[PDB]
Paper text:
[name] belongs to the mannose receptor family, which also includes mannose receptor (MR), PLA2R, Endo180 (8), and FcRY. MR family members are type I transmembrane proteins with a large extracellular portion, a transmembrane helix, and a short cytoplasmic region. Their ectodomains contain an N-terminal cysteine-rich domain ([name]), a fibronectin type II domain (FnII), and eight (ten for [name]) C-type lectin-like domains (CTLDs). The functional studies of [name] show that it can act as a receptor for dead cells and may recognize dead cells through cellular keratins in a pH-dependent manner, as acidification usually occurs during the event of apoptosis, but the mechanism of the interaction between [name] and keratins remains unclear.
To investigate the structure of the [name]∼[name] (residues M1- S627) fragment, we expressed the fragment in insect cells and the purified protein was applied for crystallization screening. The structures of the [name]∼[name] fragment show a C-shaped conformation in both crystal forms and they are quite similar with the r.m.s. deviation of Cα atoms of 0.89 Å. Notably, the structure of the CLTD3 of [name] is different from the conventional CTLD fold with two unique loop regions (loop 1 and loop 2). Loop 1 (residue E521-C528) replaces a conserved α-helix in the conventional CTLDs, and loop 2 (residue T573-A592) becomes much longer and partially missing in the crystal structure. Recent cryoEM data also suggest that [name] may form dimers or tetramers, which might be relevant to CpG binding.
Author numbering:
A (entry chain B), B (entry chain A): 32 to 89, 92 to 187, 189 to 269, 271 to 346, 357 to 414, 416 to 490, 500 to 573, 580 to 627
Write the structure that this text describes.
């Protein structure tokens, strides 16, 4: 997976390499005798020796082995250290490699300071061939040579073995590596400005497909317009394939994996927004009927991939509450959407349009302290296939759907959404319902780039270095709306797991009391958390995005998010 | 779900109950007002209060909550103790319930001495209804009443809600509970002496199906004869359903979940013994075509399940090797199966039949030390509905298939198996091959009262109490054949995970050296094991059956296996 590296010793500055199978120190120069790689099952692979670093406990011995050996061949980094079987640490005595317990040695990659496993092992999934898209198995034996990477022939292109034994089995696939150009594996489309990849004879789970497109630099297929929906349904392009539409990795509701706005829809009524089989949270496209069906996120299906062709407060009238360049007025006289829209046209305005989470925050906290009551929103659909559009023509940037939303019914021509709940999230409604409504009309600093993004009257920033707790700063999460913005931010940053972020919640002492560094009004613990006292609290993305998990204050490191002007 | 219980305090002997929402000690009068239950997400549910025990951390408070509350409602047992959020332990001050750190209190179920988490939470899967077999979600709200178990209406039978919210969602299912009689959910069949249950409107993963019927007291369907195949092929049941044929929970090779002999086969050549999609380790039956297809163990498919209608030392001639009432002779003159069978009929004997793993051990270690050579076995098939049978009429009790075996080809009339490998495991062969062969002919205390099972010349025993390491005895695993027998024993005992067993391998001190309690010649570590030094080594069943994992010597408990008379 990805670049080879050299293993520099911290205390000496020498690079380790095997001679006759035994580890020795050497001058750190980038010749082919010092390059190390990561191969599957957490194995360290010396490229030139074609052998893998391992221990023999059957006291013990540290040397190179044939990479398919039964010896202990796995290695994990523990805070610059590198331990193996029974946490024996890789160390260097008199310039000779030896593994011993409690060793206080330091190792780091050559040319940087990051640990050996700082870069995660990236799977390289295949297409075509006989392997049905199963990922590359590194390394694999071909008549004497251990291959850690794809092979060039002309086999149609770069190819790899997909099982731990190529002498038997004989299963292989064409390597899908990240590209800059949009050919070989991709197909250009000037009409949409995005390259598509139709993995048709493959069979991957939705998470596996999303990882396959992540590692290719692309994203899972999102369909934003009717022109795209009518497309693909022609052409083999697979009979049924995955699409980025998922409920798994969002905080409630459905979304596109690339966080494009979810406003063009085409639910199969048999497998709709509210899934028939409970807990099936990942949708697929049927290239025959054209419909999108909710489905079990673990089913093995073909998949499509796409990537782009990269080229102050105000004042209003009395009663109207202000927010940035706009002002909102809530109407308690419950009315249909047509009557509310017309009545707000009479107020020389229109039904509210929402584009940021700040808009939701103000239209939940500045207007109320109802909550249970649904409130009308300008967003509406009139066409089949579904296309939600704002009443005031503004572009659809935000779609803040609740769980199992948007639940657009079959063939019903008018579909009119509203907001409910503590978070003000949206759900589709029959347009004749009589609800309250909110209407918008016009009214009347952080440091420069880079990395700062302003939410409301607070400036947020992502510190991108996997650093221990309390370094840089301590973020305080005051409300669930702040939590939601943090969720959107983390989601927009990292893909998908692998990267945690730091809260400011910490238990000094061990009494079991978690507090910020100077009132714990808001709490967002994950499943079975805290689970232990005296910890430092972190959060991540993916499923349970933003949920608080406890971490070791000593060893665990994560990224930082921090705010000013608060 | 399972039985309600009372929570007796260790130091006093009193069992706790809520009054006005606050926990107090009381005289254990086994009345319905002190009965506690387990509900999902590790929640403790008081039956009469219909509320769940919980903590408030926003300083510290222990009381009852509505089970849908956002408060900390989960509880985990730590060696008779019971901790919650941040490991605050349930305790009793002056007979009043309070959660405090480092509390040295003890709790036990009422009427016994087992801990609160000694009994595992059993899912109750459903059939019919609109939920497609998804399990019961306990508890569920119906107009004021929180229901922790299935309820009787006329609903056709017992029914439950399958989501966390039944007033919304409106998803329900028919309770599939363990039965004594063979009606209501089942269908009798005198021809086979086994009741069948065809879950057709369901969609479950292989593991969820196996657990569903495990919880039902039955086992996944195994087809042992052509009559059963022809029966299932006819029958208005599911077109495709799961069957117990799996390669996941075995040490290697395919087997039946009920450990029935795998000798009747019907592989679909499209999805055969050697899976098309690598990693597909769970097979299914097509009741239309009647073929068995290897498939992804995570696919949601219907499933069928069946339960029964319950109604040492010899000597031979020179050269021949002795084993109980039988004797084996290996022939090095490579020959076809027919030529070897005829030649051994000329020696007034027959091609070897194998019935125990001890037979495999002697025919691997007593006759040879090589290994790479395949050796003929008496087992053979002649039918197109595949049925392997011994040449000497002996009953096929053992089927010791290698990985991706039995690889029965399509329409091929003669199928003749052989043994290969270090473990002497079997694989199917074209019958014309010229191999060595082994032939058998006749020849010339523990007690079984106490749970002991004789393997070779050694008696083994499974102690049924989840006890800490070394309490009973320290088991030494000498050879891979002993490990294999242990796999058979554990598999026949426990279903499926959840129950660990104790080895004798242990690291006293923390140098990282694991040894038995009185030579580490044989080692069977699991993936990324040993993960830490100074541990006590246990093993389990399921996937990675018998593989050694390191565990805490203080807190971890497991079962015992121990041997005598060797």
């Amino acid at each position: 997976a990805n670049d080879p590296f050299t293993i520099v010793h911290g205390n000496t500055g020498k690079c380790i390499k095997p001679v006759y199978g035994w580890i020795v120190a050497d001058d750190c120069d980038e010749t082919e005798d010092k390059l190390w790689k990561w191969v599957s099952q957490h194995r360290l692979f010396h490229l030139h020796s074609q052998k893998c670093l391992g221990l023999d406990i059957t006291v013990n011995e540290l040397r190179m082995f044939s990479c398919d050996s039964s010896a202990m061949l796995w290695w994990k980094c523990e805070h610059h250290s590198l331990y193996g079987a029974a946490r024996y640490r890789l160390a260097l005595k008199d310039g000779h490699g030896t593994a011993i317990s409690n060793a206080s040695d330091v190792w780091k990659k050559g040319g940087s300071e990051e640990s050996l496993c700082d870069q995660p092992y990236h799977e390289i999934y295949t297409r075509d061939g006989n392997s049905y898209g199963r990922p590359c198995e590194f390394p694999f034996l071909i008549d004497g040579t251990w291959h850690h990477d794809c092979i060039l022939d002309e086999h149609s292109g770069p190819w790899c073995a997909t099982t731990l034994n190529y002498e038997y089995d004989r299963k292989w696939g064409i390597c899908l590596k990240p590209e800059n150009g949009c050919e070989d594996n991709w197909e250009k489309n000037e009409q949409f400005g995005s390259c598509y990849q139709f993995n048709t004879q493959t069979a991957l789970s939705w998470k596996e497909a999303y990882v396959s497109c992540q590692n290719q630099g692309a994203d899972l297929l999102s369909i934003n317009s009717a022109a795209e929906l009518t497309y693909l349904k022609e052409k083999g392009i697979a009979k049924i394939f995955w699409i980025g539409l998922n409920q798994l990795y969002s905080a409630r509701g459905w979304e596109w994996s690339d966080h494009k706005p979810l406003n063009f829809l085409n639910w199969d009524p048999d497998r709709p927004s509210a899934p028939t089989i409970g807990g099936s949270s990942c949708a697929r496209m049927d290239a025959e009927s054209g419909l999108w069906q909710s489905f079990s996120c673990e089913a093995q299906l073909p998949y499509v991939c796409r990537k782009p062709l990269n080229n102050s407060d105000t004042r209003c009238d009395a009663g109207w509450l202000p927010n940035n360049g706009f002002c909102y007025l809530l109407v308690n006289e419950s009315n249909s959407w047509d009557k509310a829209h017309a009545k707000c046209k009479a107020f020389s305005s229109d039904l509210i349009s929402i584009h940021s989470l700040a808009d939701v925050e103000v239209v939940v906290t500045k207007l109320h302290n109802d909550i249970k009551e649904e409130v009308w929103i300008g967003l509406k659909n009139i066409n089949i296939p579904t296309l939600f559009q704002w009443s005031d023509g503004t572009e659809v940037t935000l779609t803040y759907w609740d769980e199992n939303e948007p639940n657009v019914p079959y063939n019903k021509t008018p579909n009119c959404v509203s907001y409910l709940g503590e978070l003000g999230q949206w759900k589709v409604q029959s347009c004749e319902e009589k609800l309250k409504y909110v209407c918008k009309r016009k009214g009347e600093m952080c440091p420069p780039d880079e990395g700062w993004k302003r939410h409301g009257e607070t400036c947020y920033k992502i510190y991108e270095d996997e650093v221990p707790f309390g370094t840089n700063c301590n973020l305080t999460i005051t409300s669930r709306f702040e939590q939601e913005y943090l969720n959107d931010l983390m989601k927009k940053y990292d893909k998908s797991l692998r990267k945690y972020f730091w809260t400011g919640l910490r238990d000094v002492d061990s009494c079991g009391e978690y507090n910020w560094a100077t009132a714990v009004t808001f709490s967002n613990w994950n499943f079975l958390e805290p689970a232990s006292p005296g910890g430092c609290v972190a959060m991540s993305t993916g499923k349970s995005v933003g949920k608080w998990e406890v971490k070791d204050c000593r060893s665990f490191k994560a990224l930082s998010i921090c705010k000013k002007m608060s």
